[PDB]
Short mmCIF file of C-alpha atoms in Angstrom, two decimals:
data_model
loop_
_atom_site.label_atom_id
_atom_site.label_comp_id
_atom_site.label_asym_id
_atom_site.label_seq_id
_atom_site.Cartn_x
_atom_site.Cartn_y
_atom_site.Cartn_z
CA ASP A 6 -0.16 0.22 -0.14
CA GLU A 7 3.44 2.05 0.51
CA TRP A 8 3.76 1.45 -2.72
CA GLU A 9 0.41 3.43 -3.58
CA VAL A 10 0.60 7.13 -4.99
CA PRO A 11 -2.24 8.52 -6.37
CA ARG A 12 -3.48 8.81 -10.18
CA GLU A 13 -2.85 12.14 -10.30
CA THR A 14 1.00 12.42 -10.50
CA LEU A 15 0.97 10.29 -13.53
CA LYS A 16 0.60 11.23 -17.25
CA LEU A 17 1.06 8.72 -19.42
CA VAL A 18 2.31 10.26 -23.35
CA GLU A 19 1.91 7.60 -25.76
CA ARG A 20 1.92 3.82 -26.12
CA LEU A 21 5.68 1.58 -25.59
CA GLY A 22 4.02 -2.24 -26.12
CA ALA A 23 0.85 -3.74 -25.71
CA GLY A 24 -0.14 -7.50 -24.16
CA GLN A 25 -2.69 -9.48 -24.10
CA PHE A 26 -3.61 -8.36 -20.87
CA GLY A 27 -3.36 -4.52 -21.14
CA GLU A 28 -0.93 -2.00 -22.40
CA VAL A 29 2.74 0.59 -21.05
CA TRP A 30 2.62 3.46 -22.24
CA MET A 31 5.18 5.61 -21.04
CA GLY A 32 4.54 9.15 -19.19
CA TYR A 33 6.00 11.63 -16.38
CA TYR A 34 5.27 11.13 -12.53
CA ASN A 35 5.09 14.35 -10.78
CA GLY A 36 6.04 16.51 -14.88
CA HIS A 37 9.71 15.18 -13.97
CA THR A 38 10.57 11.66 -13.99
CA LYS A 39 9.77 9.48 -16.60
CA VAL A 40 7.86 6.49 -16.39
CA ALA A 41 6.12 2.82 -17.54
CA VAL A 42 2.71 2.82 -16.76
CA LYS A 43 1.40 -1.88 -17.08
CA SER A 44 -2.07 -1.14 -17.25
CA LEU A 45 -3.95 -4.11 -16.75
CA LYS A 46 -6.90 -4.63 -19.77
CA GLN A 47 -10.11 -5.25 -17.39
CA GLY A 48 -11.42 -8.66 -18.15
CA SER A 49 -8.37 -10.28 -18.60
CA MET A 50 -7.20 -11.00 -15.54
CA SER A 51 -7.51 -10.29 -11.55
CA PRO A 52 -7.33 -7.50 -9.85
CA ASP A 53 -4.30 -9.48 -8.10
CA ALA A 54 -3.03 -11.97 -10.23
CA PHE A 55 -2.02 -8.85 -12.34
CA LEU A 56 -0.63 -6.59 -9.50
CA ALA A 57 0.96 -10.11 -8.08
CA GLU A 58 3.97 -9.43 -10.57
CA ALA A 59 4.51 -5.73 -8.71
CA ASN A 60 4.49 -7.67 -5.48
CA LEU A 61 7.12 -9.93 -6.80
CA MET A 62 9.16 -7.22 -7.66
CA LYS A 63 8.79 -5.62 -4.69
CA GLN A 64 11.00 -8.16 -3.33
CA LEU A 65 13.68 -7.90 -6.15
CA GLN A 66 15.62 -5.50 -6.91
CA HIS A 67 18.69 -5.09 -8.40
CA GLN A 68 19.86 -2.92 -10.74
CA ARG A 69 20.43 -5.79 -13.78
CA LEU A 70 16.68 -5.87 -13.06
CA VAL A 71 13.16 -2.88 -14.08
CA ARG A 72 12.93 -2.02 -10.74
CA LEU A 73 8.52 -1.36 -9.90
CA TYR A 74 8.99 2.48 -8.78
CA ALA A 75 4.93 2.64 -7.59
CA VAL A 76 1.40 0.83 -8.60
CA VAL A 77 -2.64 2.23 -8.52
CA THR A 78 -4.70 0.14 -7.22
CA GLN A 79 -7.66 1.45 -8.36
CA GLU A 80 -9.15 0.79 -11.32
CA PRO A 81 -8.33 0.98 -13.71
CA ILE A 82 -4.71 -0.97 -11.96
CA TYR A 83 -1.52 0.32 -12.77
CA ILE A 84 1.81 -0.26 -12.23
CA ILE A 85 4.14 2.24 -12.36
CA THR A 86 7.79 1.05 -12.95
CA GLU A 87 11.53 2.94 -13.95
CA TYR A 88 11.54 3.94 -17.70
CA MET A 89 14.00 2.09 -21.10
CA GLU A 90 14.22 4.87 -23.12
CA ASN A 91 15.63 2.47 -25.41
CA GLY A 92 12.97 -0.14 -25.65
CA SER A 93 13.71 -4.33 -25.77
CA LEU A 94 17.04 -5.98 -26.66
CA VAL A 95 15.16 -8.02 -29.74
CA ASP A 96 13.90 -4.53 -31.71
CA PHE A 97 16.78 -2.06 -30.86
CA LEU A 98 19.74 -4.10 -32.35
CA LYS A 99 17.73 -4.19 -35.82
CA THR A 100 17.28 0.25 -35.06
CA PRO A 101 20.14 1.46 -37.55
CA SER A 102 21.94 2.39 -34.01
CA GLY A 103 22.09 -1.20 -32.95
CA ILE A 104 22.77 -2.64 -36.18
CA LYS A 105 26.37 -0.87 -35.89
CA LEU A 106 26.79 -2.50 -32.29
CA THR A 107 30.34 -4.16 -32.18
CA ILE A 108 30.43 -8.29 -30.87
CA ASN A 109 32.79 -6.49 -28.28
CA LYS A 110 29.29 -5.04 -27.29
CA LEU A 111 27.32 -7.39 -27.86
CA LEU A 112 28.19 -9.67 -25.57
CA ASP A 113 29.29 -6.79 -22.73
CA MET A 114 25.72 -6.63 -23.22
CA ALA A 115 25.26 -10.54 -22.47
CA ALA A 116 27.80 -9.71 -19.63
CA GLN A 117 24.67 -7.89 -18.67
CA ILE A 118 21.82 -10.34 -18.75
CA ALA A 119 23.44 -13.18 -17.21
CA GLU A 120 24.67 -10.28 -13.72
CA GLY A 121 21.52 -10.15 -13.61
CA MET A 122 20.35 -13.21 -13.97
CA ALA A 123 23.03 -14.35 -10.69
CA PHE A 124 21.21 -12.39 -9.04
CA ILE A 125 17.31 -14.05 -9.71
CA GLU A 126 19.98 -16.93 -9.06
CA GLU A 127 21.36 -16.46 -5.85
CA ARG A 128 17.06 -15.43 -4.15
CA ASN A 129 16.00 -18.31 -5.75
CA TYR A 130 13.40 -17.43 -8.26
CA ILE A 131 13.41 -17.81 -11.65
CA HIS A 132 11.85 -15.72 -14.59
CA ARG A 133 10.91 -18.12 -16.85
CA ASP A 134 10.17 -15.85 -20.31
CA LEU A 135 14.02 -15.11 -20.76
CA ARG A 136 14.54 -13.82 -24.63
CA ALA A 137 15.53 -10.30 -26.22
CA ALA A 138 12.24 -9.41 -26.14
CA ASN A 139 11.75 -8.77 -22.32
CA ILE A 140 15.76 -7.57 -21.92
CA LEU A 141 15.08 -3.54 -21.83
CA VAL A 142 18.21 -1.69 -22.95
CA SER A 143 18.72 2.10 -21.29
CA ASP A 144 19.92 5.01 -22.65
CA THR A 145 23.91 4.64 -22.29
CA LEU A 146 24.00 0.62 -23.78
CA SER A 147 22.76 -1.17 -21.03
CA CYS A 148 19.84 -3.82 -20.34
CA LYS A 149 17.81 -5.03 -18.09
CA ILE A 150 15.88 -7.73 -17.10
CA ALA A 151 11.99 -7.74 -17.45
CA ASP A 152 8.83 -8.50 -17.76
CA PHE A 153 8.46 -10.37 -14.28
CA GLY A 154 5.26 -12.21 -14.37
CA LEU A 155 5.62 -15.89 -15.51
CA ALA A 156 8.52 -15.58 -12.67
CA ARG A 157 7.91 -17.46 -9.68
CA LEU A 158 9.86 -17.64 -5.88
CA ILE A 159 11.47 -21.67 -5.62
CA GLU A 160 11.18 -22.96 -2.21
CA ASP A 161 10.50 -26.50 -3.28
CA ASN A 162 12.78 -28.02 -6.09
CA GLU A 163 11.43 -26.86 -8.82
CA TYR A 164 7.99 -24.77 -10.69
CA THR A 165 5.15 -27.10 -12.05
CA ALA A 166 3.39 -25.18 -14.32
CA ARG A 167 -0.67 -25.66 -14.52
CA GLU A 168 -1.89 -28.68 -17.35
CA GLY A 169 -2.56 -26.35 -19.85
CA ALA A 170 0.40 -23.81 -19.81
CA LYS A 171 1.63 -23.10 -23.21
CA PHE A 172 5.10 -21.48 -23.56
CA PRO A 173 7.37 -20.70 -27.16
CA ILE A 174 8.94 -23.83 -28.11
CA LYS A 175 12.15 -22.43 -29.90
CA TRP A 176 12.69 -19.92 -26.20
CA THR A 177 11.90 -23.30 -23.18
CA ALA A 178 14.13 -25.99 -22.18
CA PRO A 179 12.29 -29.29 -23.44
CA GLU A 180 11.64 -30.49 -19.22
CA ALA A 181 9.33 -27.49 -19.36
CA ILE A 182 8.02 -27.90 -22.38
CA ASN A 183 7.68 -31.72 -22.09
CA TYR A 184 6.59 -32.11 -18.37
CA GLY A 185 5.57 -28.13 -17.21
CA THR A 186 8.52 -28.66 -14.91
CA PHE A 187 10.96 -24.73 -14.08
CA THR A 188 14.12 -24.63 -12.73
CA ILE A 189 16.91 -21.68 -13.10
CA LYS A 190 18.52 -24.79 -15.19
CA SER A 191 15.27 -23.92 -17.33
CA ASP A 192 16.23 -19.98 -17.70
CA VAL A 193 19.63 -20.73 -18.28
CA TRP A 194 18.70 -23.02 -21.71
CA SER A 195 16.89 -19.88 -22.43
CA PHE A 196 19.72 -17.83 -22.50
CA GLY A 197 21.28 -19.54 -24.28
CA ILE A 198 18.67 -19.21 -27.20
CA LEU A 199 19.00 -15.47 -26.09
CA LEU A 200 22.82 -14.87 -26.88
CA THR A 201 22.34 -16.18 -30.39
CA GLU A 202 19.05 -13.02 -30.74
CA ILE A 203 21.81 -11.01 -29.49
CA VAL A 204 24.73 -12.45 -32.33
CA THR A 205 22.87 -12.08 -35.13
CA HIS A 206 20.70 -8.81 -34.18
CA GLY A 207 17.25 -9.35 -33.31
CA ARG A 208 16.26 -12.86 -35.37
CA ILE A 209 14.46 -15.28 -34.74
CA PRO A 210 16.29 -19.12 -33.66
CA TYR A 211 16.34 -21.96 -35.65
CA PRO A 212 16.32 -19.70 -38.95
CA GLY A 213 14.26 -22.15 -41.57
CA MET A 214 12.62 -24.39 -38.71
CA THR A 215 9.38 -24.98 -37.76
CA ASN A 216 8.58 -25.64 -34.19
CA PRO A 217 8.08 -29.76 -34.82
CA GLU A 218 11.49 -29.58 -36.17
CA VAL A 219 12.96 -28.11 -33.59
CA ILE A 220 11.74 -30.53 -31.23
CA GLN A 221 12.20 -33.54 -33.60
CA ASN A 222 16.18 -32.62 -33.58
CA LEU A 223 16.39 -31.40 -30.74
CA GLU A 224 16.03 -35.50 -29.02
CA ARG A 225 17.96 -37.01 -31.61
CA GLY A 226 20.44 -35.05 -30.16
CA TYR A 227 21.36 -31.72 -33.05
CA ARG A 228 21.28 -28.54 -31.11
CA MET A 229 20.73 -24.93 -33.07
CA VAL A 230 23.04 -24.59 -35.42
CA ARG A 231 26.22 -21.96 -35.90
CA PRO A 232 24.71 -18.38 -36.01
CA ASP A 233 26.29 -16.50 -38.80
CA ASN A 234 29.37 -14.66 -37.83
CA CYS A 235 29.51 -16.42 -34.66
CA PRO A 236 32.60 -16.96 -32.56
CA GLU A 237 33.10 -20.12 -31.65
CA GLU A 238 33.90 -19.33 -27.98
CA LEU A 239 30.27 -17.75 -27.60
CA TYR A 240 28.53 -20.83 -29.98
CA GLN A 241 30.01 -23.36 -27.42
CA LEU A 242 29.61 -21.42 -24.46
CA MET A 243 25.68 -21.06 -26.33
CA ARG A 244 25.66 -25.58 -26.05
CA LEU A 245 26.94 -25.33 -22.57
CA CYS A 246 23.34 -23.75 -21.54
CA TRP A 247 21.75 -26.05 -23.72
CA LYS A 248 23.36 -29.07 -21.75
CA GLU A 249 20.41 -32.38 -21.49
CA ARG A 250 20.10 -32.97 -18.14
CA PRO A 251 19.48 -30.07 -16.48
CA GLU A 252 22.30 -30.42 -13.63
CA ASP A 253 24.91 -30.31 -16.52
CA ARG A 254 23.65 -26.24 -17.05
CA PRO A 255 26.19 -24.02 -15.95
CA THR A 256 25.04 -20.87 -13.16
CA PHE A 257 24.65 -17.87 -14.30
CA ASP A 258 26.89 -16.09 -12.47
CA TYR A 259 29.49 -18.32 -14.54
CA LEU A 260 28.36 -17.10 -17.87
CA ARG A 261 28.54 -14.08 -16.68
CA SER A 262 32.32 -14.53 -15.94
CA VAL A 263 32.96 -16.38 -19.13
CA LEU A 264 31.59 -13.16 -20.84
CA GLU A 265 33.53 -10.72 -18.65
CA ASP A 266 36.46 -12.82 -20.23
CA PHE A 267 35.05 -12.82 -23.48
CA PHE A 268 34.33 -8.86 -23.62
CA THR A 269 37.55 -7.92 -22.22
CA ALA A 270 39.72 -10.44 -24.59
CA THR A 271 37.72 -8.53 -27.44
#
């Protein structure tokens, strides 16, 4: 309730993004500070379900993660957060400004995302929706993890999603697709796919392959074909995130540590 602010301190300016559950507008809080304001599409989700995402953000604060600012608990409900001037990493990499980024800056950002994921890891949470579209970029070209709508605290060894839940096959770990089971090692797999999105400047994973073809090739033991122009060192780091047995995948602090080493070396 202490995160509450009167609706009048906010003035929306333009839509940033939208979703099944509402939209995200850019705005100003008390005139001088730019903020992102997420709104709920009355009917889509229950108010609690919506605000659940903000209560989770109250427990997870870090520079590498999109910061909760305020909430408006009266209809229409708002979740106010930190504004990231350059939008989604997936879209930005395709802009004139992003096409220009060298492999050295691409490695820096990958390491920045792993550092955010390392904190999520140490705090016993999972994101479950790790992909370039859910990484936001600031005006100083730093990255922050966003969209904690699927994030969950893990107390007992894993998290199992409800029976009807569907997930982005190209981005989701085999165990999560097959049995709905998620752990931080599932996010590690997603991160490896996220890395392919970085090096290709926003391209769809598994170029030319449909979802069923991806599933089949993964079951045979194949993994994503080496992305074009991808350093072999990074590709082999990508493969570690794609180990069949979840426990064989590395931790995020190891991922971050190796990526920083690739960054310093380039």
